[PDB]
Amino acid sequence: NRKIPDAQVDAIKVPPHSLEAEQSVIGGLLLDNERWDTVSEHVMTQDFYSRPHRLIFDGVKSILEAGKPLDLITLSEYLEQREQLEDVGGFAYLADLAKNTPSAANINAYAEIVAERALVRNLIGVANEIADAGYDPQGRNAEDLLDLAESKVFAIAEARTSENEGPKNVDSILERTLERIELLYKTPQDGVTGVNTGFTDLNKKTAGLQGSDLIIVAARPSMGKTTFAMNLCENAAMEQDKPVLIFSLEMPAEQIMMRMLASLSRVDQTKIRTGQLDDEDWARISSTMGILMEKKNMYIDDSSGLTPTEVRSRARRIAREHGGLSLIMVDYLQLMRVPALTDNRTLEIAEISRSLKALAKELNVPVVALSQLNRSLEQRADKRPVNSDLRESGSIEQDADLIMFIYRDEVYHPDSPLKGTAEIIIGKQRNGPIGSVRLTFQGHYSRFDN
Amino acid sequence: IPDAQVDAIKVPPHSLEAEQSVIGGLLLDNERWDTVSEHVMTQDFYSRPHRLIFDGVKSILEAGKPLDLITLSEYLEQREQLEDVGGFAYLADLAKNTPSAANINAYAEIVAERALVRNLIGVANEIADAGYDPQGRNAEDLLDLAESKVFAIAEARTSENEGPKNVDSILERTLERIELLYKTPQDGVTGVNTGFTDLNKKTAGLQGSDLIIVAARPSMGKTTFAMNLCENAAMEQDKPVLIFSLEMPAEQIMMRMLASLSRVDQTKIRTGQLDDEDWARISSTMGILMEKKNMYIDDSSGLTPTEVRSRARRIAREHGGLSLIMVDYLQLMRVPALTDNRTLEIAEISRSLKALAKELNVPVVALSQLNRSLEQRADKRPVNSDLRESGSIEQDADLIMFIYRDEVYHPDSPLKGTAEIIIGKQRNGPIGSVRLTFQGHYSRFDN
Amino acid sequence: AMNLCENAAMEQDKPVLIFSLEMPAEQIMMRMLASLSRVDQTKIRTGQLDDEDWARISSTMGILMEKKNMYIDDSSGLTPTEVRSRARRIAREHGGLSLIMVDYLQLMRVPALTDNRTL
Amino acid sequence: SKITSEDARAANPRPPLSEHAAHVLLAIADQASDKVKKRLQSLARLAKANQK
Amino acid sequence: SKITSEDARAANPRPPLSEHAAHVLLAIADQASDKVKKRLQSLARLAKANQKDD
Ligand SMILES: Nc1ncnc2c1ncn2[C@@H]1O[C@H](COP(=O)(O)OP(=O)(O)O)[C@@H](O)[C@H]1O
Ligand SMILES: Nc1ncnc2c1ncn2[C@@H]1O[C@H](COP(=O)(O)OP(=O)(O)O)[C@@H](O)[C@H]1O
Ligand SMILES: [Mg+2]
Ligand SMILES: [Mg+2]
């Protein structure tokens, strides 16, 4: 029983490592300084297990970043200046590192091994931290511990998310371009290549709601911004097998559903609210409900003050159940929060916009985000909304792939000949033309028609 | 021996007390099984004896048999498990040590929470073991394994208590809401009566959970309008009206209320020149107000959203709810954490009041001032942009009402004595305008 | 700016480096194809290319592939340090660069100066 | 004022539930899950008519 | 009527691929790297002979 713990302590206390790969990376850089650009993309100083190798690698990094030639003497002088040469094993050990790896062109493979070992080392460290938190919660509830575990594991995965993206040569872009064209040609392209908007005129200009697109729908209050976005959701839910995810930060799920019922059933929204539904109204609502229940392809999250991380987490959860998502709608971008950027609202909104674009690319799903137009527009009130009206609220234009504005002349001019008509202005579009689409606005039904 | 044992915590998270309370509570009521069974499973119990006892409870109740100490003891005796749980005495002790009912759901949540942490620790150990001994799995495979096991823990606690997100849950809540509306008299008003027919036609009353912003330029009758809503709620509802008068004292609010309900000249009340008829009307009005006792006036200055919420909860507990909450001037409130930014401070107050409205299921009326820039234009009616310049309160408001009096800007207006109530924003109804008779002498709005 | 890049790519042996912070690499290439081939951009987008249009696009592609003197980096929110690092990497492979194009200056970020956009 | 208040059509709301609505609610309850079926039957039970 | 009233250029899509395009795609594939060569050959394979007018 006394010989059992010594072998177990030696085999369990040593984390995964590769001293040989670490030595080969260092030795290889001493042989060919030009490989630093590639090696620096794979490994960081903290990726090394051995303390002496971290100090040596830090020296290598400092010399090469300064544009100085990396050799045994230069590195030794660097470490000597910081009184770290004795801590790494002396000049003899540096010479041994250069001697023990006479082979070049394999340095990238050794860098990947060092990075892989560091990843497992970080994973074990996180597992121990989570275990410690589980044993000693220090006042944290189960939900907080689950969120902590998810956050720490997600951080490990995020670090290894886009590791080898640097080199972007024309041959690679041509292959991806042809692959994309091939995919479009294989799918039925009768004017719509993405998620159907339900509006022919809009689809003619946008070719549908594209995957990976961050779409900003902006309007002044009561222009039908929520109404328009919901019609896009309704169309995606009725035409796609994949689910629609709605983050209703302003309105409750019951209210969104009631408006949806008013829209799909073409029943007066006021009648639904007041309960004065006739036999015909009940039959239409019931038929609509029957279809919605048959489809079951819609999720409504009415949680307030969600962070981009929480939005991403919930989206991934649902996407895993169905092998993807048809559309993600975020009710009001400005209602989201970023605890790290509370000191600056503009930067906070800019980060939310960047995070939602990253979410769109990550899940290959169109992300519709609703935004409010700046108050300065009402002072002018002479022309249609423009991109500058949104720039004043967080520079969201830079991250958006598509910007759509909602304008109703009847709101500003009740005697307008365009009563019941809403203009959808394309303010920005990466994969199509800019312009305007006229839609029939039916406020009583909370619906837009072509 | 003890130093290493004290440092090492081999005991996983558990709550024997909560487990005993769940078992003891079910022995006391039986009908609570449907709720408890939604939160806890037999495996959620840490203690082996409690798992066996709970399994017995589950079997008896699922069979529709009455659960009592004798029935449970006989059940366990048939399976030779009675000795394994501590005997009849331990079952009797479990029923004795929890004499309190209505907290069984809270204990069930604690047991479930502990089981969740217990499963999490188990998964963490499995991941640690996989990390130490990968058995031929690469780092990517270990990461996928860790993600899969953690996702499995999260999925078990996804949609536990009705899980609001899926269509089945929304359908149930939709039908429950329709049922509630149909049970209450719906003669055009589904919420708190405004006292104005034309306004009720558009709003269907003041809805529960709504944050209502009433905005007006000075002397447009903003306080007057909000108080008429309070007076109507106080006279038509059994639940109390709570007023946070941050600008005016309680005596002044009451005097204006007396002028309104009694239709006695406000100046006469102030000056004391009341005739016999005036005294009789004021006295009758006072008699009714005292009989109702359904109004609270808090005239404390510089209240924080937390203080407002705290006082509202205190009163709501006494009456099982509130009919209406009125906050005199949103801008007069304070947020000590956001003193560096007035816009953010006002935005937080607006968010907090909306949260308060949802928390207590009560309409919250908050008075706001229109921006000074409107007077520079003075060519059209107030709009939502006039409020956005003062804290972006539009985003949080469920209903925005503006007060406009043409006679204030144009004394020779043909609309003398008429005030226009503009619906600038409405979530559950149409936008538009309602004309009301403004009687400044009585501090009253009429239909 | 892209016509300047196209001319530099066709007339110089050294590579052209493009930091497209707003548009993806596929979109930049499609616009380049429309430019060098003198084919209607809408036709390229819609796929309604005639025999003549295909021949011109194909010839242009053949030349671009033969030259291989262009790099497109479509990474968003790049820092000046990252831009400098990637530029040096490519320059080392060819003994220099012919031209560096940065799509929108305002789209870049400086984590140390988040408190002031002008600075 | 009475003219101004009741001008656009007489507003006499009469919302008692019809036997027809109760019948359709029960028809839906036959296709609904047990949880929804109970709520639909409850709503149909609340529907009063008793004609003939 | 909406189409006729707001017609931003005649949208007549004619996408049949020509044998000529397939030939040029294969000619480029000869100079392309293995990864690009496979995509160009795949695109040329997708090109169907829809010749007409004669
Ligand atoms: N009962 C109703 N009858 C007619 N129109 C209504 C009714 N309820 C709402 N509306 C209209 O529906 C629209 C709701 O706008 P909404 O999308 O919620 O606001 P925002 O643009 O701020 O997101 C408005 O144009 C409003 O006039
Ligand atoms: N004695 C009085 N006689 C007539 N009108 C009065 C009298 N006292 C107050 N008023 C009117 O009552 C209104 C009070 O406005 P108030 O609601 O207190 O202001 P605010 O809009 O800033 O909240 C004004 O329109 C004022 O002219
Ligand atoms: Mg909305
Ligand atoms: Mg006041």
Residue numbers in the entry:
A (entry chain A): 10 to 459
B (entry chain B): 13 to 459
C (entry chain B): 238 to 356
D (entry chain C): 104 to 155
E (entry chain D): 104 to 157
The authors write:
To decipher the molecular interactions between DciA and DnaB, we solved the crystal structure of the DnaB·DciA complex from Vibrio cholerae (Vc) together with ADP and Mg2+, forming a heterotetramer composed of the canonical VcDnaB dimer and two molecules of VcDciA. The asymmetric unit of the crystal contains two molecules of VcDnaB and two molecules of VcDciA. The crystal structure of the VcDnaB·VcDciA complex revealed domain swapping between symmetry-related molecules of VcDciA. The NTD and CTD (N-terminal and C-terminal domains) of two VcDciA molecules connected by an extended hinge region (residues Glu99–Ser121) are exchanged between neighboring molecules related by a true crystallographic twofold rotation axis. Therefore, formation of the complex with VcDciA does not alter the overall canonical architecture of the VcDnaB dimer or the NTP binding site. Interestingly, the CTD tail of VcDciA, which was observed to be disordered in solution by SAXS, folds into a small helix hairpin in contact with VcDnaB, again in agreement with our previous molecular-dynamics analyses.
